[PDB]
């Protein structure tokens, strides 16, 4: 086998990613929005 | 009032009810000291016509010059045009003023001036 790694001769083939080689690209699932809030809670606020 | 985020941070008064038309609300805000409150109101009133530019509205805030018709004067002249004594404008000596002190309470209405 050449997948496992052997630590005495380095044996250690060198392969590249597969996916970045070709690119499957499909978009990206943003179907939400994802908001940012403030720190306290509440930002603007009057007085009563 | 522009400058959306402005209620955030820190004010002053002339960064908000000078270099810019305010609300009398962050005036009310920014100053509490009511009767401060009401002299700044009287400014703004007066300088309704010194609202531009910025050094106008210093220079009414100063308040040695009149607007206009005078509403906003608050030197120290005491004396008519000719060298007669003002009379109090308070006191009734030796006229009784249907127009006075408490007619009018907020012009600051001096000893005589
Ligand atoms: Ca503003
Ligand atoms: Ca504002
Ligand atoms: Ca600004
Ligand atoms: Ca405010
Ligand atoms: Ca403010
Ligand atoms: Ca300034």
């Known amino acids: ?48 | 009032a522009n400058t959306f985020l402005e209620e955030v941070r820190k004010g002053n008064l002339e960064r908000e009810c000078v270099e810019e038309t305010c609300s009398y609300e962050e005036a009310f805000e920014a100053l509490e000291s009511s009767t401060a409150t009401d002299v700044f109101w009287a400014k703004y009133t007066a300088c309704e016509t010194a609202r531009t530019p910025r050094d106008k509205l210093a220079a009414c805030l100063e308040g040695n010059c009149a607007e206009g018709l005078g509403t906003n004067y608050r030197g120290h002249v005491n004396i008519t045009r000719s060298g007669i004594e003002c009379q109090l404008w308070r006191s009734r000596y030796p006229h009784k003023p249907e127009i006075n002190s408490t007619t009018h309470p907020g012009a600051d209405l001096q000893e005589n001036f």
């Open chain 1, 1 to 48: 086998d050449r997948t496992r790694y052997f630590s005495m001769w380095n044996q250690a083939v060198d392969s590249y990613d597969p996916d970045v080689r070709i690119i499957e690209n499909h978009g990206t699932e943003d179907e939400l929005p994802n908001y940012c809030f403030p720190l306290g809670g509440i930002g603007i606020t009057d007085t009563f």
